[PDB]
Design a protein around this ligand. Structure first.
Ligand SMILES: [Ca+2]
Ligand SMILES: [Ca+2]
Ligand SMILES: [Ca+2]
Ligand SMILES: [Ca+2]
Ligand SMILES: [Ca+2]
Ligand SMILES: [Ca+2]
Ligand SMILES: [Ca+2]
Ligand SMILES: [Ca+2]
Ligand SMILES: [Ca+2]
Ligand SMILES: [Ca+2]
Ligand SMILES: [Ca+2]
Ligand SMILES: [Ca+2]
Ligand SMILES: [Ca+2]
Ligand SMILES: [Ca+2]
Ligand SMILES: [Ca+2]
Ligand SMILES: [Ca+2]
Ligand SMILES: [Ca+2]
Ligand SMILES: [Ca+2]
Ligand SMILES: [Xe]
Ligand SMILES: [Xe]
Ligand SMILES: [Xe]
Lengths: 318, 318, 318
């Protein structure tokens, strides 16, 4: 079911593309339109080959040249598009990690929404790129049950999806009820073990049974029982278990709701998911907010940045 | 013939074990008894899996938590037990290497008693763990013929055991006689080449022939001809060629002989050899010192430390 | 057709060799003659095995000992001979790279004359040895079109030799004519793309056609149109396309022409090419300068340095 919005261009000629891009920047000024039309129409792997052909022909670094010619949010988007897909989540995490100035929204968004297979790949790329252990750095800049839940998720050890055992569903739903609503205070450890390690298909059934038993959705309990960064993370984990595309659609919605735009979040989501499930994200977005992702981006963004974003997204008639 | 005292626990459940350990430390105080009974009854590989399950369930680092809860020599022993077997000798060497403050006893003990196959593995683990070349660091903190002999041994290039050539045995025994007892001064280079590079089975025959020719055991010549760190190393090499378990039994004996205990040596030997030849060490110990290793540990050690050591050793009725 | 002047010694005994070398340095003074006669008569791989046997027997580092005993240009040559072949070009490049004090002659000589297969191997060895990216370091210490051409060559992406297309030969020869002689100023980008990326066999035909069209050899155009480091690099690239051995023969010729000797260049060329094409270099040298490489070295060099160089070169009767 999972589909992105960007695929390999048929009849790709990396050398031709590199020439077009050189022409766009060569000499006075910059043809931003030529740049954005080309790069939004090539897959990430294809952008890498363009970069290598550009360096072969001209002995210039393509990204460095674009960083020189381009400006503002447009530049930020183009540089994000050029990052190899295998490194992008790691790069975003690395840039989130910076002392008490750490960007917890980013840690939560990525770590909650990436699959165990994705996280294994992220941990490897991060260590190779930056010479540090991701878990160590996360532990360094976080504290409390928030850190613990992140470490649990970073183990990428979630139970595999297997046949559902109804008695285990009952036991876990009851455990959660006893650990939160029936407890003075909260047994956070219990929530973390169950939400962090049980399989996705098992937890979906647990969530339904928990509603049946308690009269609350698990998200309602979480808001009633916790707060702060732990609350945001537990909500992101639950929402991701229910539907990753739905959680990411919501993330996009809130980046553009209110005054201005959370541009960093907008760029990160669109670029990171453009070859995975951005199509599914569009669908969830239109189902849940009765408005196209396209029309919300169109209304929230300006100039070449807007143009490039809309080309990546598609879905005018969503 | 080689047997350790610790083996894989049958019916191992890493998750269950992790829960037991969490219960032991959770909240006020610490159940040291639960900790030592469990960990001494699991193999090193099994301890690693427990650590991974603990982190998966609770998002806590098991060793860090134990370092927080435990104290003293007991803590030192538990942390030593948790070090992956493939890294432990490298860790001990790294910790021995520290300027003119270097711990030569440790360099000698490990490098003399480990097989060429073990040393190849140690050199690799050390470089991977610490980003340094073991040989370079040894050379950095040692001097003289002591350093040279260590470098020779670090090459892990000892002749393989093959059919014994009686004439070569005669030649080497005579060479040794001429290089030491018949020489004004000592040709250390000759001792180092022969002791450092000839095969174990060849040198065992050389030692017997040397006694026949000279009327001295090679160990007696070494004490007569050399002194200081070179003497200790040459003795350790000879004793290891004769019997590694016997050399390690002697090492343990002297750690506990006299006032107090060399606890660092006691922990290192017991832990490092617990899955290789600690059973053989016990046997040599009882043969050579007419007393059980168990009874000597029992008499020399206190509290939870004593309990854990005795469980690892076994051999009450040795 | 490609032949070196040094090959594997038949009946090689690394242990025997190590003993000879130890004897040469042991005690007061040094037997330089024994050292140079042996090492010039062993291949690079064989020198590595000698070094390992020396360390195994004596626990001494062979190169460190030679650095201690030897002096001057002789020492520099012996140390160069001991560097593993797979690391030598990388070592020379690393030593060329040092701020505005950078040795451009070395960057040009190596990068222009090494094949794409050789450069791939060099880039890998450099990163492994020094923890840095070669391209990054080159970019750091160079500027302008000189840097660009070096980066192009460092991509090691030259078109493969395939069937020649006469129309493409015409197009490229005309392109070059239009980019230089017919242009006010020079389109350096065009020269760099064509000279840097087209196949060797294609460019050889382009050079002939360019002469036919313009009445100039490409080297004459280069001198007419460019200057400085870019000129030297473009000439080295063209000369290498025509004949690597011929370019290296010329490089040697100029190292010894005039007062004194460029010893660093002499050592680098002889050692780096001794197992590849130094025989071909000798032949080109004798064809083009009507004098033996041997006789020029003999006349330009002194002492043990001279002796060792002449043994490596051969070709008294060239
Ligand atoms: Ca421009
Ligand atoms: Ca413009
Ligand atoms: Ca910019
Ligand atoms: Ca509660
Ligand atoms: Ca709340
Ligand atoms: Ca807005
Ligand atoms: Ca506690
Ligand atoms: Ca207690
Ligand atoms: Ca402690
Ligand atoms: Ca003597
Ligand atoms: Ca003595
Ligand atoms: Ca004692
Ligand atoms: Ca000497
Ligand atoms: Ca001399
Ligand atoms: Ca010297
Ligand atoms: Ca011109
Ligand atoms: Ca010129
Ligand atoms: Ca000269
Ligand atoms: Xe919670
Ligand atoms: Xe000795
Ligand atoms: Xe040129």
């Amino acid at each position: 079911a999972l589909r992105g919005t960007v695929t390999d261009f048929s009849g790709f000629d990396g050398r031709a593309d590199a020439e077009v891009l050189r022409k766009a920047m060569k000499g006075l000024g910059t043809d931003e339109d030529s740049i954005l039309n080309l790069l939004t129409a090539r897959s990430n792997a294809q952008r890498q080959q363009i970069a290598e052909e550009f360096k072969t022909l001209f002995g210039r670094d393509l990204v460095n040249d674009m960083k020189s010619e381009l400006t503002g949010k447009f530049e930020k988007l183009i540089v994000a598009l050029m990052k190899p897909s295998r490194l992008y989540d790691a790069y975003e995490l690395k840039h989130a990690l910076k002392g008490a100035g750490t960007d917890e929204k980013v840690l939560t968004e990525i770590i909650a929404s990436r699959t165990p297979e994705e996280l294994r790949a992220i941990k490897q790329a991060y260590e190779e790129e930056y010479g540090s252990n991701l878990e160590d750095d996360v532990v360094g800049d976080t504290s409390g049950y928030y850190q613990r839940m992140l470490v649990v998720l970073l183990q990428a050890n979630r139970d595999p999806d297997t046949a559902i055992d109804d008695a285990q569903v009952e036991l876990d739903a009851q455990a959660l009820f006893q650990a939160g609503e029936l407890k003075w205070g909260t047994d956070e450890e219990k929530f973390i073990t169950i939400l962090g390690t049980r399989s996705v298909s098992h937890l979906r059934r647990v969530f339904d049974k928990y509603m049946t038993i308690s009269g609350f959705q698990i998200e309602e309990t979480i808001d009633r029982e916790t707060s702060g960064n732990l609350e945001n993370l537990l909500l992101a984990v639950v929402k991701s278990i229910r539907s990753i595309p739905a959680y990411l659609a919501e993330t996009l919605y809130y980046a553009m709701k209110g005054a201005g735009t959370d541009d960093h979040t907008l760029i990160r989501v669109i670029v990171s998911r453009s070859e995975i499930d951005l199509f599914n994200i569009r669908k969830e977005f239109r189902k849940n907010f009765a408005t196209s992702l396209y029309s919300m981006i169109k209304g929230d963004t300006s100039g070449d940045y807007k143009k490039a974003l809309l080309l990546l997204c598609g879905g005018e008639d969503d």
